[PDB]
Amino acid sequence: STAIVTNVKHFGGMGSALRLSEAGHTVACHDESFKQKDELEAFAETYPQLKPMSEQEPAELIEAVTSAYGQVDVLVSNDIFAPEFQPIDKYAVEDYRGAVEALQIRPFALVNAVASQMKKRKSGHIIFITSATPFGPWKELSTYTSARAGACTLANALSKELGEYNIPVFAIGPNYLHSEDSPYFYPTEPWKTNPEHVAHVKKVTALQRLGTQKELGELVAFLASGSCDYLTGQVFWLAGGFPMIERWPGMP
Amino acid sequence: STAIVTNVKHFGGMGSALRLSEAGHTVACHDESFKQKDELEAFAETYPQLKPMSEQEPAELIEAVTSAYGQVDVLVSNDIFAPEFQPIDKYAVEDYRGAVEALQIRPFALVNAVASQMKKRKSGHIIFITSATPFGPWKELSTYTSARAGACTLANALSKELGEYNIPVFAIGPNYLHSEDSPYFYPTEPWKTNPEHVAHVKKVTALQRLGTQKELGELVAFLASGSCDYLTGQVFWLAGGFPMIERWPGMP
Amino acid sequence: STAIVTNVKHFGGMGSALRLSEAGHTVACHDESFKQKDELEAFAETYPQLKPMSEQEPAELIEAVTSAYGQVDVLVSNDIFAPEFQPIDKYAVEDYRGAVEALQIRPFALVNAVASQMKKRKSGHIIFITSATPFGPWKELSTYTSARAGACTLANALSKELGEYNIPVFAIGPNYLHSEDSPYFYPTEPWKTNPEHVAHVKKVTALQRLGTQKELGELVAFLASGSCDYLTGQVFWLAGGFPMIERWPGMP
Amino acid sequence: STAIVTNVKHFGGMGSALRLSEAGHTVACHDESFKQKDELEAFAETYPQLKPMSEQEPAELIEAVTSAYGQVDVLVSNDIFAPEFQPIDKYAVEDYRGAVEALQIRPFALVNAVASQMKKRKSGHIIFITSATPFGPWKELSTYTSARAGACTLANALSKELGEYNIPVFAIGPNYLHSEDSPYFYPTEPWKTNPEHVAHVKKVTALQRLGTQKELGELVAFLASGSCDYLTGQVFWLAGGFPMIERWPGMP
Ligand SMILES: c1ccc([C@@H]2CO2)cc1
Ligand SMILES: c1ccc([C@@H]2CO2)cc1
Ligand SMILES: c1ccc([C@@H]2CO2)cc1
Ligand SMILES: c1ccc([C@@H]2CO2)cc1
Ligand SMILES: [Cl-]
Ligand SMILES: [Cl-]
Ligand SMILES: [Cl-]
Ligand SMILES: [Cl-]
């Protein structure tokens, strides 16, 4: 079928797009860099199996894909945002508006555009790549963290109205997901090379390692395959058992 | 100590103000209607034990109460919004921004304004009046429900950084809370008068009744008293057992 | 690899066994009816791709499958119990012990038996089939519901220590899962035939239908494939959107 | 009114009994040591405001108090158990049966005995002192941790059926609660004296300190006062913001 994967170059985009592609889906890909013809084409050249789009806005995109490839059957809103860690009083109120717009508004807009067609054919799948930070908050990241929670809940609420139209909605909240070259949010350097970061990951996750893109993709391809729609409304914590709680003094 | 209760005429406003005032607090009150001196003075006249302020913006309000009454020890962000129920595709993206602006950005702006003074004294209490809908989502209220979840998570995330300064932070998510003459969100008419509504409330809640403003007020006063700061980060579901799940055919 | 599916004739048993077998696994199956050679051989004859065992106790079973098929890589603790709905005061304390013995002690006994061999190879997968009732409790089913919550938490707690040995642990809490000829817990009669029951299911679930054994089987096979071990600790709610919350009077 | 507080000498018993007493309640107290006349009397001597009972079993106790003081209006099942930290394969299946019996069966039995009288007068309050470990599991404590979760869920499920009879049920799950002289589970020595333990607590809780008995008591007296019954079914995490998640390398 036809699927859309946003910000394909960062976070969980590549594992998603690629695995969905492997699963024989037509995968239209969105990303900021697809504004410049050089970047888009460089992309379509390197990945002949992915269909990169230039459209940037939600509605514009949905339409581009609907026309170009018939319709949108799967939506993987892979949302990102570059947050600053800061005491609440040191943030600017616009620093929160940025986070909310990038992590909550964007996916809402996306579902607000493709929603009618899926409901009309009574079929489709919706997936949000959010974050596992709401499950175990770090201090001084209130903006990013709270916005992610809104997205998780958005997904669950939507599963309630779209179930009637046979449309599953899921939220996958990762943490410590190897983003490889992308800086969102766990690039090979330093997470896989610098001893300190390697030891941190080792300590805070139960599996003692970063999550791989293939694992994320396998989940997305599985959910979008229609093999287990009864899971609609589920928030998946892709965080290798994180967080590992520190134990009492004297314990290994 | 000095407390601030926003949108005092609606939602949890009166219960919070009155019970906080009966506890001994100096309660500065905010509300949109107070932009008019006629309203502010009428309110002031009916409630001599409350201090209605005309300030509307976060920074201005905190500063105004800090001047008049020395400081702000307790902040009760009684946030409200009038959402429409609607299929995700029938909403306008602006209908989500609006909801997020009033239910998330607003409480964030207020804490972002009072946070520094509390951290300096290393004392204070922050309480968000959110909603219990995230716990049991209804279909077609995706903007208002997810916005509330952002607020709850904001409170918990904030509890992590402010705890170092001995500042508790809580979220009280109500549902079926009698708002008396206020339309936010369960006014006496028709919730305590109309048989259809009375029946509904009787079915969906365990205690089979609306919550009272006195219960919400007691909880707010208790949390801000310092009797139990160890609860910091807690999300309180004030909904009398809601949601009661419908049982199998043949059962009473 | 070798998998063990308990109580294979009931609950999630068949879906798990069949789909696990279609994936390539050697599926040793347990069941109470297999204490009788007549039953074990009849089952063996109908399902030549399944390996029905007669062992009943945890230690004996793990040992028996370890001998016959080399080892145990995947454990699917498909636990069942026939609880009565009743006011807490109408239950007998023994009615809780019984429930806890079959829904908690049993899965614990099994993992306690296979844990060492998996930790030595540093490979394996543990999956508990629990229940989604903890998420949306019904009144008068306090023994069965709380026992299931113990099972879920057991799975997550176990995911923390076993992750170091590269052993994922999951819990799949189903609800409204078609159990076909099995009485545990939604048999074809009357759940797919009686209009009263068909209506109920249509109201309380988002997808408005029973879950299928194929969906539960797909999920079990996916989790045990190694495609996404980073999900370790996850509690999967397999209930098609349940619980759908009853809306305000006047709404459709 | 008349209230019962079990294991009054350990965990949250003293803060509960005493504060309830201060609140002008007749407080019958249970404890193992109240088997020997020497211990009971020593207790009744030291605390003339508390009424210690010798009865040990649930039913025997409820009856003793009902007769002696008219009826039981408040039940505070303060449950304890001395667990061993151990890899799952190193536990004995009876080590789990112990935990379950002490942490799940006991409170169930207690509510199973006093339940009918509360439902008949359509009034009463039920409180479980459980544990916050299910919210943030440590590795190798699967027994204690999973059983606590069962108790938390028991409480929530009971809130559903007893709400109809106007009986609130709550669960208070502490962690790092100063148990003073009692070894259950954070005695002054070493938690308040040995630098290592003091630094641990400082690190894993947001408030950076143990929770006090007075805080626990204030909550119990507040819930049992009938000031906020609309909170029925709530699980209160009394853990000063625990757990504090470890942040990225380089961060303070
Ligand atoms: C900062 C940004 C993003 C994360 C992971 C995806 O949530 C963690 C810290
Ligand atoms: C609509 C708006 C608000 C509510 C209660 C407070 O959350 C319910 C329906
Ligand atoms: C009774 C027993 C079991 C269920 C489903 C599996 O949890 C529902 C009612
Ligand atoms: C062991 C036993 C009890 C605890 C606290 C109360 O839960 C922690 C470790
Ligand atoms: Cl991540
Ligand atoms: Cl409300
Ligand atoms: Cl089921
Ligand atoms: Cl504790």
Side-chain angles (χ1 to χ4, degrees), chain B residues 148-166:
Chain B
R148 290 295 201 188
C152 290
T153 291
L154 212 209
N156 183 262
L158 286 183
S159 76
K160 306 296 179 186
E161 61 177 281
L162 297 180
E164 177 185 346
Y165 300 82
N166 191 46

PDB file of all heavy atoms in Angstrom, chain B residues 148-166:
ATOM      1  N   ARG B 148      -4.919  18.276  28.103  1.00  0.00           N
ATOM      2  CA  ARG B 148      -4.939  18.039  29.543  1.00  0.00           C
ATOM      3  C   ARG B 148      -3.819  17.085  29.994  1.00  0.00           C
ATOM      4  O   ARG B 148      -3.257  17.244  31.078  1.00  0.00           O
ATOM      5  CB  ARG B 148      -6.295  17.456  29.961  1.00  0.00           C
ATOM      6  CG  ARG B 148      -7.473  18.429  29.887  1.00  0.00           C
ATOM      7  CD  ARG B 148      -7.330  19.569  30.878  1.00  0.00           C
ATOM      8  NE  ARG B 148      -8.617  20.207  31.176  1.00  0.00           N
ATOM      9  CZ  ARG B 148      -8.761  21.322  31.895  1.00  0.00           C
ATOM     10  NH1 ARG B 148      -7.696  21.937  32.394  1.00  0.00           N
ATOM     11  NH2 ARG B 148      -9.973  21.816  32.126  1.00  0.00           N
ATOM     12  N   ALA B 149      -3.509  16.093  29.164  1.00  0.00           N
ATOM     13  CA  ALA B 149      -2.465  15.123  29.465  1.00  0.00           C
ATOM     14  C   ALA B 149      -1.117  15.827  29.456  1.00  0.00           C
ATOM     15  O   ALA B 149      -0.194  15.453  30.183  1.00  0.00           O
ATOM     16  CB  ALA B 149      -2.480  13.994  28.434  1.00  0.00           C
ATOM     17  N   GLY B 150      -1.000  16.844  28.615  1.00  0.00           N
ATOM     18  CA  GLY B 150       0.230  17.603  28.569  1.00  0.00           C
ATOM     19  C   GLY B 150       0.386  18.342  29.882  1.00  0.00           C
ATOM     20  O   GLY B 150       1.481  18.410  30.426  1.00  0.00           O
ATOM     21  N   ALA B 151      -0.717  18.889  30.388  1.00  0.00           N
ATOM     22  CA  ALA B 151      -0.703  19.613  31.648  1.00  0.00           C
ATOM     23  C   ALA B 151      -0.289  18.685  32.791  1.00  0.00           C
ATOM     24  O   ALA B 151       0.600  19.038  33.560  1.00  0.00           O
ATOM     25  CB  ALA B 151      -2.080  20.230  31.920  1.00  0.00           C
ATOM     26  N   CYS B 152      -0.912  17.504  32.893  1.00  0.00           N
ATOM     27  CA  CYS B 152      -0.571  16.541  33.949  1.00  0.00           C
ATOM     28  C   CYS B 152       0.915  16.220  33.911  1.00  0.00           C
ATOM     29  O   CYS B 152       1.608  16.333  34.917  1.00  0.00           O
ATOM     30  CB  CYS B 152      -1.346  15.221  33.803  1.00  0.00           C
ATOM     31  SG  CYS B 152      -3.118  15.311  34.155  1.00  0.00           S
ATOM     32  N   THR B 153       1.398  15.804  32.749  1.00  0.00           N
ATOM     33  CA  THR B 153       2.805  15.474  32.607  1.00  0.00           C
ATOM     34  C   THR B 153       3.699  16.677  32.899  1.00  0.00           C
ATOM     35  O   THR B 153       4.814  16.523  33.400  1.00  0.00           O
ATOM     36  CB  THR B 153       3.089  14.911  31.207  1.00  0.00           C
ATOM     37  OG1 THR B 153       2.476  13.618  31.113  1.00  0.00           O
ATOM     38  CG2 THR B 153       4.589  14.782  30.948  1.00  0.00           C
ATOM     39  N   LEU B 154       3.212  17.876  32.609  1.00  0.00           N
ATOM     40  CA  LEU B 154       4.006  19.060  32.890  1.00  0.00           C
ATOM     41  C   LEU B 154       4.217  19.142  34.402  1.00  0.00           C
ATOM     42  O   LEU B 154       5.323  19.401  34.873  1.00  0.00           O
ATOM     43  CB  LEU B 154       3.287  20.323  32.419  1.00  0.00           C
ATOM     44  CG  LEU B 154       4.156  21.494  31.939  1.00  0.00           C
ATOM     45  CD1 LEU B 154       3.412  22.794  32.203  1.00  0.00           C
ATOM     46  CD2 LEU B 154       5.491  21.515  32.644  1.00  0.00           C
ATOM     47  N   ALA B 155       3.145  18.926  35.153  1.00  0.00           N
ATOM     48  CA  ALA B 155       3.191  18.984  36.607  1.00  0.00           C
ATOM     49  C   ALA B 155       4.195  17.986  37.197  1.00  0.00           C
ATOM     50  O   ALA B 155       5.018  18.340  38.047  1.00  0.00           O
ATOM     51  CB  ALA B 155       1.805  18.721  37.169  1.00  0.00           C
ATOM     52  N   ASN B 156       4.116  16.741  36.741  1.00  0.00           N
ATOM     53  CA  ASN B 156       4.996  15.677  37.207  1.00  0.00           C
ATOM     54  C   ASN B 156       6.449  15.961  36.820  1.00  0.00           C
ATOM     55  O   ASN B 156       7.361  15.753  37.625  1.00  0.00           O
ATOM     56  CB  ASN B 156       4.531  14.332  36.620  1.00  0.00           C
ATOM     57  CG  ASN B 156       5.344  13.145  37.122  1.00  0.00           C
ATOM     58  OD1 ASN B 156       6.251  12.687  36.452  1.00  0.00           O
ATOM     59  ND2 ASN B 156       5.018  12.650  38.315  1.00  0.00           N
ATOM     60  N   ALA B 157       6.671  16.431  35.595  1.00  0.00           N
ATOM     61  CA  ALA B 157       8.024  16.734  35.150  1.00  0.00           C
ATOM     62  C   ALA B 157       8.591  17.851  36.019  1.00  0.00           C
ATOM     63  O   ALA B 157       9.751  17.806  36.441  1.00  0.00           O
ATOM     64  CB  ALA B 157       8.028  17.154  33.684  1.00  0.00           C
ATOM     65  N   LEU B 158       7.761  18.854  36.279  1.00  0.00           N
ATOM     66  CA  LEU B 158       8.168  19.983  37.107  1.00  0.00           C
ATOM     67  C   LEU B 158       8.468  19.532  38.535  1.00  0.00           C
ATOM     68  O   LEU B 158       9.377  20.062  39.167  1.00  0.00           O
ATOM     69  CB  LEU B 158       7.088  21.070  37.103  1.00  0.00           C
ATOM     70  CG  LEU B 158       6.979  21.895  35.809  1.00  0.00           C
ATOM     71  CD1 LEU B 158       5.930  22.988  35.958  1.00  0.00           C
ATOM     72  CD2 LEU B 158       8.331  22.528  35.490  1.00  0.00           C
ATOM     73  N   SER B 159       7.733  18.544  39.038  1.00  0.00           N
ATOM     74  CA  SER B 159       7.986  18.064  40.391  1.00  0.00           C
ATOM     75  C   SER B 159       9.421  17.535  40.551  1.00  0.00           C
ATOM     76  O   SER B 159       9.984  17.577  41.645  1.00  0.00           O
ATOM     77  CB  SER B 159       6.982  16.966  40.785  1.00  0.00           C
ATOM     78  OG  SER B 159       7.275  15.720  40.173  1.00  0.00           O
ATOM     79  N   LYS B 160      10.014  17.059  39.459  1.00  0.00           N
ATOM     80  CA  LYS B 160      11.364  16.508  39.495  1.00  0.00           C
ATOM     81  C   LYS B 160      12.448  17.564  39.695  1.00  0.00           C
ATOM     82  O   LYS B 160      13.387  17.340  40.457  1.00  0.00           O
ATOM     83  CB  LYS B 160      11.659  15.731  38.213  1.00  0.00           C
ATOM     84  CG  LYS B 160      10.661  14.636  37.863  1.00  0.00           C
ATOM     85  CD  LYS B 160      10.614  13.517  38.882  1.00  0.00           C
ATOM     86  CE  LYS B 160       9.573  12.476  38.463  1.00  0.00           C
ATOM     87  NZ  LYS B 160       9.360  11.402  39.466  1.00  0.00           N
ATOM     88  N   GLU B 161      12.342  18.702  39.012  1.00  0.00           N
ATOM     89  CA  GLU B 161      13.348  19.747  39.176  1.00  0.00           C
ATOM     90  C   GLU B 161      13.102  20.645  40.388  1.00  0.00           C
ATOM     91  O   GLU B 161      14.048  21.030  41.069  1.00  0.00           O
ATOM     92  CB  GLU B 161      13.469  20.618  37.916  1.00  0.00           C
ATOM     93  CG  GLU B 161      12.221  21.365  37.517  1.00  0.00           C
ATOM     94  CD  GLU B 161      12.430  22.259  36.306  1.00  0.00           C
ATOM     95  OE1 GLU B 161      12.985  23.371  36.467  1.00  0.00           O
ATOM     96  OE2 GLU B 161      12.046  21.847  35.187  1.00  0.00           O
ATOM     97  N   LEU B 162      11.843  20.966  40.675  1.00  0.00           N
ATOM     98  CA  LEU B 162      11.533  21.835  41.806  1.00  0.00           C
ATOM     99  C   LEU B 162      11.651  21.175  43.180  1.00  0.00           C
ATOM    100  O   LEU B 162      11.734  21.856  44.199  1.00  0.00           O
ATOM    101  CB  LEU B 162      10.136  22.426  41.635  1.00  0.00           C
ATOM    102  CG  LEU B 162       9.953  23.333  40.409  1.00  0.00           C
ATOM    103  CD1 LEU B 162       8.516  23.846  40.375  1.00  0.00           C
ATOM    104  CD2 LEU B 162      10.939  24.506  40.446  1.00  0.00           C
ATOM    105  N   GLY B 163      11.672  19.850  43.209  1.00  0.00           N
ATOM    106  CA  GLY B 163      11.782  19.158  44.478  1.00  0.00           C
ATOM    107  C   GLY B 163      13.063  19.502  45.203  1.00  0.00           C
ATOM    108  O   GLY B 163      13.129  19.470  46.427  1.00  0.00           O
ATOM    109  N   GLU B 164      14.091  19.835  44.445  1.00  0.00           N
ATOM    110  CA  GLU B 164      15.371  20.183  45.029  1.00  0.00           C
ATOM    111  C   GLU B 164      15.258  21.488  45.810  1.00  0.00           C
ATOM    112  O   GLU B 164      16.050  21.754  46.717  1.00  0.00           O
ATOM    113  CB  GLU B 164      16.407  20.329  43.920  1.00  0.00           C
ATOM    114  CG  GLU B 164      17.762  20.763  44.394  1.00  0.00           C
ATOM    115  CD  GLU B 164      18.707  21.016  43.246  1.00  0.00           C
ATOM    116  OE1 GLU B 164      18.393  20.601  42.100  1.00  0.00           O
ATOM    117  OE2 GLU B 164      19.765  21.632  43.500  1.00  0.00           O
ATOM    118  N   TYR B 165      14.274  22.303  45.450  1.00  0.00           N
ATOM    119  CA  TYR B 165      14.063  23.578  46.120  1.00  0.00           C
ATOM    120  C   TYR B 165      12.910  23.474  47.120  1.00  0.00           C
ATOM    121  O   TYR B 165      12.354  24.484  47.568  1.00  0.00           O
ATOM    122  CB  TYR B 165      13.785  24.656  45.080  1.00  0.00           C
ATOM    123  CG  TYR B 165      14.918  24.832  44.104  1.00  0.00           C
ATOM    124  CD1 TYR B 165      15.048  23.985  43.000  1.00  0.00           C
ATOM    125  CD2 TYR B 165      15.884  25.827  44.290  1.00  0.00           C
ATOM    126  CE1 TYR B 165      16.112  24.117  42.100  1.00  0.00           C
ATOM    127  CE2 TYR B 165      16.954  25.972  43.394  1.00  0.00           C
ATOM    128  CZ  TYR B 165      17.060  25.115  42.302  1.00  0.00           C
ATOM    129  OH  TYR B 165      18.096  25.265  41.404  1.00  0.00           O
ATOM    130  N   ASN B 166      12.551  22.235  47.451  1.00  0.00           N
ATOM    131  CA  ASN B 166      11.487  21.955  48.404  1.00  0.00           C
ATOM    132  C   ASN B 166      10.122  22.523  47.991  1.00  0.00           C
ATOM    133  O   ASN B 166       9.357  23.022  48.820  1.00  0.00           O
ATOM    134  CB  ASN B 166      11.893  22.479  49.782  1.00  0.00           C
ATOM    135  CG  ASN B 166      10.977  21.990  50.864  1.00  0.00           C
ATOM    136  OD1 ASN B 166      10.651  20.801  50.922  1.00  0.00           O
ATOM    137  ND2 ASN B 166      10.548  22.895  51.733  1.00  0.00           N
TER     138      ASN B 166
END
